[PDB]
Each structure stands twice: as structure tokens, then as C-alpha cells.
Amino acid sequence: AFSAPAAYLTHQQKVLRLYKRALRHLESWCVHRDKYRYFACLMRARFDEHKNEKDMVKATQLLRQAEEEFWYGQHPQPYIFPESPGGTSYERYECYKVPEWCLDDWHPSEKAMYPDYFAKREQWKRLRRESWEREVKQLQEETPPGGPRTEALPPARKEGDLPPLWWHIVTRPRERPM
Amino acid sequence: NVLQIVRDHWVHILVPVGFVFGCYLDRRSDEKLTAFRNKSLLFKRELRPNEEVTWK
Amino acid sequence: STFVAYLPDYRMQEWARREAERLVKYREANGLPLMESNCFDPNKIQLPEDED
Amino acid sequence: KRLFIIKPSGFYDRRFLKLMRFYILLTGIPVAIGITLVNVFIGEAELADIPEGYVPEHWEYFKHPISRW
Amino acid sequence: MLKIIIPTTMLLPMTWMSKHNMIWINATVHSLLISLISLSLLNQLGENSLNFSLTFFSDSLSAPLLVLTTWLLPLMLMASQSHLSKETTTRKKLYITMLILLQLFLIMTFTATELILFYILFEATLVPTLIIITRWGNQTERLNAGLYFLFYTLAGSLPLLVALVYIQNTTGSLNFLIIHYWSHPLSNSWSNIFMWLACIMAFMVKMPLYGLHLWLPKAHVEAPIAGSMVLAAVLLKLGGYGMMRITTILNPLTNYMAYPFLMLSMWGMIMTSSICLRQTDLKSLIAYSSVSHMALVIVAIMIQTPWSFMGATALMIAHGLTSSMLFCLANTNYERVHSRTMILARGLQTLLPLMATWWLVASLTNLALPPSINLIGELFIITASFSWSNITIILMGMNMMITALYSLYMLITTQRGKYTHHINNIKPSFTRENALMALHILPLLLLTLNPKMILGPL
Amino acid sequence: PDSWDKDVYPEPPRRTPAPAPQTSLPNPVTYLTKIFDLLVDRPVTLAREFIEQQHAKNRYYYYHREFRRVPDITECEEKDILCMFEAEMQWRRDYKVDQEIVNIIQERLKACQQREGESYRQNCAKELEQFTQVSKAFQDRYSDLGAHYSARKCLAKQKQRMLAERKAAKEAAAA
Amino acid sequence: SDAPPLTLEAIKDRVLYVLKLYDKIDPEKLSVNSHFMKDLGLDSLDQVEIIMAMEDEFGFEIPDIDAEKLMCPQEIVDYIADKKDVYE
Ligand SMILES: CCCCCCCCCCCCCCCCCC(=O)OC[C@H](COP(=O)([O-])OCC(O)COP(=O)([O-])OC[C@@H](COC(=O)CCCCCCCCCCCCCCCCC)OC(=O)CCCCCCCCCCCCCCCCC)OC(=O)CCCCCCCCCCCCCCCCC
Ligand SMILES: CCCCCCCCCCCCCCCCC[C@@H](O)O[C@H](CO[C@H](O)CCCCCCCCCCCCCCC)COP(=O)(O)OCC[N+](C)(C)C
Ligand SMILES: CCCCCCCCCCCCCCCCC[C@@H](O)O[C@H](CO[C@H](O)CCCCCCCCCCCCCCC)COP(=O)(O)OCC[N+](C)(C)C
């Protein structure tokens, strides 16, 4: 969610992702801890049995067969962490998330409460206004002529710079806003 | 000082005056359809010792 | 809303209910049928002479 | 610790609701009081036979005082 | 009934003599007063109509329509003054003049005693609507919309005119009371069939009937907000009122001339409800909703029973209020984001809670939640159709399932989910918009409290 | 009470059994109903007595409106608009009164069904028969006139039924 | 009430606690800056198992693209703190 994706996944990445998926589904099948540990050690042995195959074609064939076996033997109802995309609390608190710009529309009577908070907010807004043009200039310099090729962004490099395009990442609402 | 107030808010009598004039014209229209007043078989009635017409 | 709620009964619902009450009382007292299938008296109707 | 909770401005909706309640009540509390006072101290008419030779006014054919008025 | 007509004609010079910054206040105040005066027409009899003069009369069918018209004028004024702020004083006065002239024409149309006077006023309503659409609409399509609005109407109404004058040469009168008392049956001949079609098609295209409805999405989408309000709430009901008036001379031909129109109405009600499920423009969805409800009204008028007539009257009133409210609700979002695409602005319940409550209530009345008068009209029509044929409950039933779906779909798309991140210009709701929503919705429930006022002469 | 006529809305003599306690335990229902009496029924009775005292000091009357009988649609010439108008108004009033008669009979039926409890199928036979007769008469008079009904269409329907009945009677006579 | 307000020190303590219960890592030789591959001599499968153990410890899932990059306990602690809005 945080890292910029690459153009493709490598063979090692696919093997590791299959290993994690297989272990998770095996834990879903093996509810008890000791049984899961036993069969997970067996699965790890089965995985590292073919770790030293120098023929890449045979390696991809083995990966293909393993993925077919996984799809046949997957748990139809695997365990999902409650806040994971399939969980029971996945987007539960999205209705409580309010963007910060709404605070600009508060009536002055509402802003009369919380004076110090709004003074700090004004300081942050001043910082963003002072940093924007330098961020844009740094992005203009660091970008190759044929446009960017990845979604990775550079850090700040100068004396008192800020990493470009930082406002909406830094001022995230919260994970439990209200 | 009522001069400025009148010249600013004299448009507020047009609609009430129109309502009154419409009521008057409706009464005038009713005045022209009395050919069967106190003459229907259902409502024909003897006049009271004082009243002249059954309705206006 | 108050003006509409207190509008006088020009639809004659209560009048019709009272008239029906009187009619039912009279007809049940004298043993007549409550309602007749004919709403017009046949003696005031002249049917065509021949049906053949 | 106590944290600031970011919400949209609730001032304007509350103001509208208060204004609507105020005006509705401003005209509807006198109406309710008047209806109650009329009902208590000027009841409904009692149905009676028409006396011989009397021609009632049209508003005399209804029973509630407000409807008659 | 000049006590209602003359004050509107007085609204005209009152608007044209007002100070430049008092036009809206004066127009709104005196429009509300005129609505209060027109409230007295609801005192109706059980036997005949209120015959004011040789020219005007009031029935139990036209009085709620007049009340709806006079109540809709101030709401239109309130909804229009936001997007007309940059306009010049003369053009604002001209816009208000168009609205006033439309109200006057509608008021005289609903109370005319003769059919030719009714026809003249019912065509005269065309000019202010067309001017409003083509002069104050926002996009380039408005011009095309105007053309679609005009000719679709006139191609229906020009035959009717001919039929009308023909009838006056045969019976000697077009007075509605004389026409009703001296009614004679229509024989089964080709001439009578074409007379029936000439008498029916103008009102059919006004409803509109499915297959003749293409003008409506264009005109109701391209119009300004007041234009859409008056097009959905009142101008569609001209067809139903005219059909219920004109059917008194078409028996017993209707007994079999209604079949193609009944089939079109039922199947096209299903079709337009289905179309509402895949719509990217929020205004077009509301327009197709209007088409489905009017198909129900057409079925009710065509089967010609007392229960169907009561249901048709109730449904017309309820739909007018509900569709006007829905158009205003969509216009608030459009004025905020300047786009009619439904999925552009999402999660608006988080940003505007009271407006979300208004959305919920409007969508609840659209799907005819009991005991709303929407549901009362729909249920009366469905019961009458069941008496007409037991199989209709299938199609009607399907409609009831689809309507709710798309209705809730609309709500779920606009109010729920997460807000769009890049839209940062959503300001809090103004007092004017909340008052507009309340003045739409409160009369609906108040009418539920006393439903016999919108059930018609039957 | 005396608010309604007891012959138009009759009720049985209301036989109810006397309490027959068989247990030494007290009856919570009796204790609760005594509390309800003393705590609810008395203040309401006093308020009603005050309201009725106020009402008695201002006694005024309203009257039931009387309509005389005008000629029916059968006695009207073909194009005589005034007689047709009066006859049509009289016919509409009669239609409303007939609807209210049916309503009274249906009220009787519903009340009997609720009153008789588990024995309603046998104990409501008379009300069911009365409703059957009234419904048949009303259906003969007014059904199928449609919207845009009038006295003339009702007369045409009655004439058609009379013609059919006369033909059936004469054909049965020839048997 | 609900769970206590997780702090950075608690997160680091639990991460180190999980790591010292792993039989392939020497407890004394382990520090908060030790690299899994260079310092500790583990391969990619061990890193996947470590990430899964962290997920079990803290009751939430770390996506694969983010989990591949974590190489020392400090990165794991920082990722968990950033995810859960921990600032103290
Ligand atoms: C909040 C705003 C926010 C926005 C919201 C939107 C708002 C929109 C509003 C739009 C405008 C709306 C206007 C509509 C106009 C309609 C007015 C109307 O027609 O009134 C009708 C009706 C009056 O009818 P009426 O024809 O005038 O009366 C005929 C008779 O002549 C009368 O009989 P009477 O001779 O017996 O006299 C009775 C008299 C006196 O009766 C009594 O005194 C007796 C009562 C019992 C007392 C007995 C015991 C108590 C005392 C004992 C102790 C003291 C005595 C001993 C002292 C010592 C103590 C021990 O009382 C009355 O007169 C009736 C009350 C008057 C109410 C009028 C309503 C007007 C409202 C208009 C304003 C609208 C806005 C609202 C604002 C209003 C202010 C809040 O008013 C009522 O509403 C009555 C309802 C109460 C009946 C009981 C309820 C039964 C429940 C059954 C259902 C159960 C299901 C559960 C649901 C329950 C939920 C309720
Ligand atoms: C924001 C907070 C909301 C919640 C809080 C609310 C607090 C409580 C308030 C809610 C009240 C609950 C309503 C319960 C009903 C009680 C009132 C009821 O009994 O009165 C009805 C009366 O209601 C009215 O009749 C209906 C109102 C009329 C509607 C017209 C609206 C005004 C015009 C506006 C523009 C028109 C646009 C639509 C065009 C068609 C009954 O009529 P009726 O049974 O006979 O009375 C018999 C005795 N009479 C005849 C002597 C009076
Ligand atoms: C897109 C939607 C537009 C709006 C929809 C409007 C619907 C209009 C449809 C008209 C309904 C019926 C019209 C006439 C009634 C019967 C028509 C005919 O088909 O029935 C038979 C008629 O018989 C034959 O069909 C002769 C007619 C055949 C010629 C008509 C052309 C129809 C072909 C389809 C053309 C499409 C027309 C619509 C264009 C848009 C009945 O036999 P018959 O008893 O003897 O005729 C009754 C009349 N009599 C008694 C005087 C003799």
C-alpha cells in the first residue's frame, strides 16, 4: 500500500507470495497450533527441496504445478484479518474520516473554541504554502525528459526542503478518526 | 419622512388590491346569474316577512 | 393546515350517514328489504311493446 | 489524551433547525391554545329538530364552532 | 375565481416596478399569499362542481392541481435566485415574468369551462416554458431540447383542435357540463376511431406515453431548475387532467381502443424503470422515474373505474411534489460541483448530513413507502388493474421491485461510500436550500394526514 | 350510550358471569384494577365533569338538513337540461345514502364476528345474510357503471335487466 | 475501555520478544539494527516467516510489496507505528 509497484514481479517474488498464501491457507485448514506447526514444517521442507534448481524453465514449471495444486486445494473460507480487504471490519471506520479542508468552512463561533489548535493549523498551512514551489521545482529537475517511469517520489535533499507531494500523505485523517 | 418609505414600498398594495378587485368582480358575476333564484324545485321557499332575496 | 382541517362538511358525509340511519331504522321496523335492486320505480318506465 | 475530532461544520444545520422550529412554534402554539380554549369553553353544537316555521342559516347545519365560523 | 387570477396579474407590474434588490422578496411573499388564498378552493361538494361563472369552474379534480401550482411558484423563485445572481436586473425581471405568466396560464387552464378555451390556454403554456429552457439553460443541447419539446407537443395537439371544432359542429357546444349531461355513445366506425385518436394523442404525448417520451429527458435535463420543477410537477399533469375530462365522450370505444396504450404503458413502465438502473446522469434518472409514474397514471385513466381515477389523482399530486424535490436535491450538488455525473461526488453524507436526511426522505417517498400518498395512489391503481385482469399484478409487481432498487441505488451512489478526495469545494448547506427541501416535504406528510383532499371527484 | 340508535346498531343483552374464587391467594388483577380506578378513572372523570359543566353553560344547536323529492330521470324530457340537473343531483344523493347503508351493514357484520369469538361461524348467520342481500341489491343498482357514471346509465342498466327478466319469464311461461 | 494506546517502546519490545523466540536467531547477537540477511544470515523464506509472525503478534496483515522490504527490527517497528498512527 505504501511502496510503489514495479512493472512486473520476479520469479523469486512469485515463489515467496505463493509460499505465504499456501502457509496461510494451510493454517486455515489446520486450526490447532501444533498441527499447523507440523504441516508448516513439512511445507517448508517441500518448498526448499527444489531450491537449488539451476534450470529456470523447470523452476517455472514447478511453480505452475504448485499454483494449480494450490487452487485445487485452497480453503473456500480462509481466515482473513478483520481489517484486511476481505475482513469483517475492512472499511468500518471510513464514514468517520473527514478531510481537513472542511475545517476551513467552520463558523467563527465554532473556531472560537480550540484557538491553539487553529493557530497550529495556520502554521502548517503557511509551511505548505512556502514549500509548494520548491517541491514543484525539484520534481521538474529530477524527472527524466520522457516523463516518469515509476511512481516513486524523491526525498528532500536541500537545506530546509520538504519531500515533494507530502501534504495529503502527512495529513491523513486517522485509522480511528472519531 | 414617509415619502421615501412610500416610494420604496408602494408595490406592496398591488396584490391585496387585486384580491379585493377580484372579489368584487366575482360578486358582480354572481349578480348576473339570478334567473333561477328561489325557483328550483329543491330549494323553492316562501320568503320571510322581512328578507327580499334568498341569496345575493 | 388548520383551515383545511376544520373545513365544514360540504361533502355531506354526516348527512348521508344520518339519512342512511333513518332509512335502515324504518325498513327494519316495517320488515321491508333494506335495499331494492331497482333504483327507479317500474311504473314510471315504459318498456318496448314487443320483444320478438 | 484528548484529540481533536475533524467534522464538517454543524453550525448551519443547527441554525436552520432552530429557525424552523421557532417559526413553526411561534404560529402553532397560539393556534393550539386557541383550539383548546374554544373546545373547553365553546363546545360542539347539539343536534336538534328544526322548530316549526324556522329557516336555519347555512352555517347552522354544522356542529363544530370553528367549522361553523 | 378572479380573486386568484387578478393577484397574479398584479404580481406582474409589482415585479416590474420593484426596486432592483427587492424583486425576490416581494415575489416570494406575494406568491405565498396567493397560495394561501387559493387554499380555499379545497371546500368542495359531493354532487356537483363550484360553477363560479359562465367561464370558470372548480372541481374536486382541479382544486388540488391549482393549489400545487400556486405553491410551486414560490419554491421555483427560491430555487432560481442562486444561479441568477450574476444576471442583470431586466433579465431577472423577465425570468420572473415568464414564471408568473406560466402560473397564470396554468390557473386558467385548470378551471376553463369550455374545451376550446382549455385548448388555447394549454397551448399558451408552451411559450414561457420554451423561452425559459432555450434562454436560461446552461448547455448547448438546450436548443435541441426546445425543439423536441415544441413539435412533439404540437404534432399531438393540432389534430385535437380539429376534432374539437368538429365536435362543436355536431353537438353545438363544448361546455363541459353540457357535454357531460348530453353524452351519447360512440359507434364502432373508422371515423369514430380516428376521432378517438385525435382526442387522445395530444394528452398521450403530454403524459408522456412510452414511445412518445423522448422529448422529456432532453427538456427536463437541459432546463434550468425552475423549468424542471414546473415541467415535472404540473405540466405533465395537463395530459392526465385533459384525458380524464375528455374520456366522458369516448365510450364505449375506449373499451377496446385502450389496448395498445395499456400494453405500451405497462411494458414501458417496466422498461423505463430498468433504464433508471443504468444511468450516468442524475437528472435523467429522475426524468425516467417521472415517465414510469406517468405510465401508471395512464393505465389508471384508461381502465376507467372510480378506484383508478382516485389513484390517478393521488399519484399525480404525490409525484409532482416528490419529483420537484428530487430535482432540487440534484441541483444542490450540481451547483456545488458543476457536473451532473452521478459518481463524481460520492460520500456526501459525511460532508452534508441534513441534506442526506432530505435525500433519504425524498427517495423513500419515490419508492412509495406506506402510508405516503404516493403509495395510496399506487395501491389504488394496482387494485383497479387487478380487477381489470388478475395477470397485471405480475407487471405492476415487477415495477415495485425495480423502482425501490434504482431509488436506493441513487441514494447509495451519492450519500454513502467514501468522499471523492480531490473535491474540496463542498460548502455547508445554506438555509435557503434546507428551507426549500422542508417546504417540499412537509406538505406531503400533511396530505397523508388527510388524504380525501387529493382523491378527486370520484 | 345514547349517542347512537340501538336499533340501527343492535347488541345482545351482555351476559357476564360473577366471580367465583376458588383459591385463598389474592387476585393481582383485582388489586391492579382498584389502583387503576383510584389513580386514573377518577381524575379523568373530574376533568370530564368540569368540561361538561362548562359546555352546559353554552348550549347551542345544529340541524339535519332536509331535502324534498324532485322528479326522477324517468320523468325528464330528452333535452330538458334543468330537470335532468335536478334529477342527477337527487340520484347522486341517493347513491351516497345507499353507500352509507352498506357501510352500516358491514359494521354490524364485523362487530358480530369480533363479539361471538370462537362461535362466529354459527352466531353471525343473520348478519351475513343481511349483508348478502344488501350487497346483491347494491351490485344490481350500481356495479359496472364505470367512471363517468350518471342517472341515465343507471336507468339504461335497469331497463336492460328488466328486458332480460321479462324475456326469461315469458320463455319459462311457455314451458 | 478499549485497548491501551500502543507506544513505540511497546511495539519495539513485542517485535524483539517475537524475534528472540525464533530458534534461528541468537538472542544475545540480536539488536534492533541487525540485518536479517547480512547480520543474522537468514534467507527469504525465513523473512516471510518472520513477517507472518509479526502479523500474528499484532493482529493485522502486511501486504507483500511492503513486507518484502523490511530487513531489520527497526523497519518493522517503524512500519507498524506508521500503520497504527503511533507518534509517541
Ligand atoms: C415541532 C416543530 C418541528 C417541525 C415538525 C413539523 C410540524 C408541522 C406542523 C404543520 C401544522 C399542523 C396543523 C394541523 C392542524 C390539526 C389540528 C386538529 O385538527 O386537532 C385535532 C385534535 C382536536 O380535535 P377537535 O375536533 O378540535 O376536538 C373535538 C372536541 O370538541 C374536543 O373534545 P373536548 O370537548 O373533550 O376538548 C378537549 C380539550 C380538553 O381536553 C382535556 O382537557 C382532557 C384531556 C385529558 C385530561 C384528563 C386527566 C388529566 C387531569 C386530571 C388532574 C386534574 C383534575 C383534578 C385536579 C386535582 C388533581 C388530582 O383538548 C383539546 O381541545 C384538544 C387539544 C388541542 C390540540 C390542537 C392541535 C393544534 C396544533 C397546531 C400547531 C402545529 C404545530 C405543533 C405545535 C403545537 C404546540 C406543541 O387534536 C388532537 O391532536 C387530539 C389528539 C389526542 C388524542 C389522544 C391520542 C390517541 C392515541 C391513539 C393512537 C395510539 C397509537 C400510538 C401513537 C400515539 C402517538 C400520538
Ligand atoms: C423537527 C422535529 C420533528 C419531530 C418532532 C415533532 C413533535 C410532535 C409533532 C408531530 C405531530 C404528529 C401528527 C399526529 C396527527 C395529529 C393531528 C390530526 O389529528 O389532525 C388531522 C388534521 O390534519 C389536517 O386535516 C391535514 C393538513 C392539511 C394539509 C394541507 C397543507 C397546507 C398547504 C401547503 C401547500 C400545498 C401543497 C400540496 C398541494 C396539493 C386529523 O384530521 P380529521 O380526522 O379530519 O379531524 C377530525 C375533527 N375535525 C374535523 C373537527 C378537525
Ligand atoms: C410509438 C407509439 C405511438 C403511440 C401509439 C398509438 C396506438 C395506435 C394503434 C391503433 C389501435 C387500433 C386502431 C383501429 C382498431 C382496430 C384496428 C384493426 O387492426 O382491427 C381490425 C381491422 O381489420 C383489419 O385489420 C383492417 C385494418 C388494416 C389496415 C390498418 C393498418 C395497420 C398496419 C400497421 C401500421 C402502423 C400504424 C402506426 C404508425 C406509427 C378489426 O377488424 P374490423 O371489425 O373489420 O375493424 C373494426 C372497425 N370497423 C368496425 C369499422 C370495421
Ligand SMILES: CCCCCCCCCCCC(=O)SCCNC(=O)CCNC(=O)[C@H](O)C(C)(C)COP(=O)(O)O
Ligand atoms: C492449502 C494447500 C495448497 C498448497 C499446495 C502448494 C504446493 C506447492 C509446493 C511445492 C512448490 C515448490 O516447491 S516450487 C520450486 C521452485 N524452485 C525454484 O524456483 C528454484 C530457484 N530458486 C529460487 O528461485 C529461490 O531460491 C527461492 C526458492 C525463491 C527462495 O528465495 P530466496 O532464497 O532468495 O529467499
